[PDB]
Ligand binder design. Sequence first.
Ligand SMILES: O=C(NCCCN1CCOCC1)Nc1cc(F)c(Oc2ccnc3[nH]cc(C(F)(F)F)c23)c(F)c1
Ligand SMILES: O=C(NCCCN1CCOCC1)Nc1cc(F)c(Oc2ccnc3[nH]cc(C(F)(F)F)c23)c(F)c1
Ligand SMILES: O=C(NCCCN1CCOCC1)Nc1cc(F)c(Oc2ccnc3[nH]cc(C(F)(F)F)c23)c(F)c1
Ligand SMILES: O=C(NCCCN1CCOCC1)Nc1cc(F)c(Oc2ccnc3[nH]cc(C(F)(F)F)c23)c(F)c1
Lengths: 291, 287
Amino acid sequence: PDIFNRDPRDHYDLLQRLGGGTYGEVFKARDKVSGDLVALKMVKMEPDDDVSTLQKEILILKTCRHANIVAYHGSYLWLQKLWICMEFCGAGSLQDIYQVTGSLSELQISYVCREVLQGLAYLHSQKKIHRDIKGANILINDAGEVRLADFGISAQIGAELARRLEFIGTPYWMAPEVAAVALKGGYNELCDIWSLGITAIELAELQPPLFDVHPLRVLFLMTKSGYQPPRLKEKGKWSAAFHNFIKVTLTKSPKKRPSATKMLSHQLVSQPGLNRGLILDLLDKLKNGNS
Amino acid sequence: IFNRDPRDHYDLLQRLGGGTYGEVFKARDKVSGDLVALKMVKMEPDDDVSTLQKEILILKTCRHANIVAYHGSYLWLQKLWICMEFCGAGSLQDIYQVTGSLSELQISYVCREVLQGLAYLHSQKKIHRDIKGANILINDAGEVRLADFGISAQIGAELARRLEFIGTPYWMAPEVAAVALKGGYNELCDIWSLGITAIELAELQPPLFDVHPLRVLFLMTKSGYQPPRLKEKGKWSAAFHNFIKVTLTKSPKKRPSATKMLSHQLVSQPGLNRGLILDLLDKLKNG
Ligand SMILES: O=C(NCCCN1CCOCC1)Nc1cc(F)c(Oc2ccnc3[nH]cc(C(F)(F)F)c23)c(F)c1
Ligand SMILES: O=C(NCCCN1CCOCC1)Nc1cc(F)c(Oc2ccnc3[nH]cc(C(F)(F)F)c23)c(F)c1
Ligand SMILES: O=C(NCCCN1CCOCC1)Nc1cc(F)c(Oc2ccnc3[nH]cc(C(F)(F)F)c23)c(F)c1
Ligand SMILES: O=C(NCCCN1CCOCC1)Nc1cc(F)c(Oc2ccnc3[nH]cc(C(F)(F)F)c23)c(F)c1
């Protein structure tokens, strides 16, 4: 039973629409038997869509499991709607949170990075790459725990897939090496480490470096040989350990960039007192105001 | 570049083709009466005129017969207009959808002319990236033209979709950004696309056209992927089959350059001239 030939409403009560976009529509839902809350992401099928083309991605969702990545519970197909059942994270993304609370403290950031590195260490051990580590893809549940998410299978099916294929010119005239890039090859898992460094600056300053610079110009600057990796803006606000964490994750050459396991030994994420309590404090601020 | 309304200098005749990524108009020059093609691209304030300003200068400077001629550009009302050589017969896809499949000689001539344009583009360190029947243009003289669209891809909707589908740069590692910038490949991709296009012109569809496109991408990734071939063996000469085999070389490090392919028997033979395509246009117009 790769995908359930069942209406998910037979098993779940939809409670609330949490959001919707190109990634699909996401609902808060309650298991009818256990009473557990879940998130249901629904993707609308096109007339030509073929769910069998998702077989290998579904196998990965079934076999990859870790506390720090959003838990996959199953998939349903019914009346041209594809549903993915996932762990529920009631506080949304860290981007959703800091847009209300303001910048996180160093210790909150240190806790987040540790939890993200644990997830990434597992993914990399399974020879997978996240590819899109950022505040918007790090979810927080009401217990203060941290879970990696992604854009999701919506990019592999539905109207989003159709829009992407139109953009690349379809694949029929495409050379093999181009096809490899279109499936997001050409680089390795250490890109996630750099992305985590940028995310730590994002949690500290409310935007990644150069966010006020045109994206094309950033691309131009990033690939010049003289490019200087970014740094935290305010020096005295952050400890040497935090500055050094930014220094070593944002290593330009991938051959010299530390792995997720090596980073988990870093002073910043190895220090005592990192626990979900730090995020419970943030969630109180989010719900009730600073005072 | 001109900071005027282009309609000051041209009369719009009719809309030839629109879409998400541009609109093309048939127009006539006021002072000279010449027919032209105008491609309108919508711009953003969030767009960057510095980058396109530099790309403008290249086209303004460098020519080739098999490249659609650049005549001028206009920025007005956040709309970029590019004035180009007008090709009265449209694309080869517009033609063969009416005429049926092309003869080997006609395909040989098309491939020669496309290779000449490619050899030139690659010498300018450019990549066409979208070689196919729909982007090979034909004028009423039966000549073959390629469109250089490099400018459009870094402004307007094309840039926005790129940022959306490939991603913004701000969280990218430098090695990832470098792939996102150039697409992550080389100019020999155009040589593969031309081999497919030759099959397209011979059979009215690229190989695997009836197969789900994602599945097609998956199959191309497999280690034992077999490059396509012409369906009907006996209908085509050995030179044509060898042309296909050589252009559809799996490894880019063994795929021949555009210049090397102009040495190939198929595109080297005498008798290849625009009269072959005049014959195709006559069939288009009459029965
Ligand atoms: O819609 C937003 N924010 C809008 C911001 C508006 N702004 C206000 C301020 O100004 C600017 C605009 N966030 C958001 C929406 C979702 F549907 C999320 O999905 C989930 C939710 C809960 N549990 C989950 N478990 C797995 C998922 C998965 F779907 F992601 F996989 C998931 C999610 F995480 C975040
Ligand atoms: O790797 C692929 N496909 C191969 C494509 C590249 N090939 C090689 C290169 O060239 C082309 C082909 N899919 C994939 C990989 C992952 F690591 C995923 O991560 C998870 C798994 C299970 N549960 C999860 N919960 C949250 C996640 C989150 F990590 F996504 F956040 C998550 C996932 F969902 C899918
Ligand atoms: O741009 C062109 N050719 C010329 C322009 C054609 N246009 C057609 C429409 O109208 C205007 C002309 N080819 C092209 C564009 C892409 F974006 C590609 O994809 C990537 C590359 C690197 N990293 C990636 N990550 C995710 C992708 C995903 F896009 F595949 F999802 C992706 C790709 F492989 C080839
Ligand atoms: O839109 C179509 N046909 C649609 C048919 C609908 N289909 C029927 C079959 O079934 C499905 C639907 N043809 C077409 C439109 C254009 F605007 C072209 O652009 C030009 C034209 C003339 N001179 C030019 N000079 C530079 C250009 C450049 F704009 F391309 F750069 C250019 C072009 F070449 C062909």
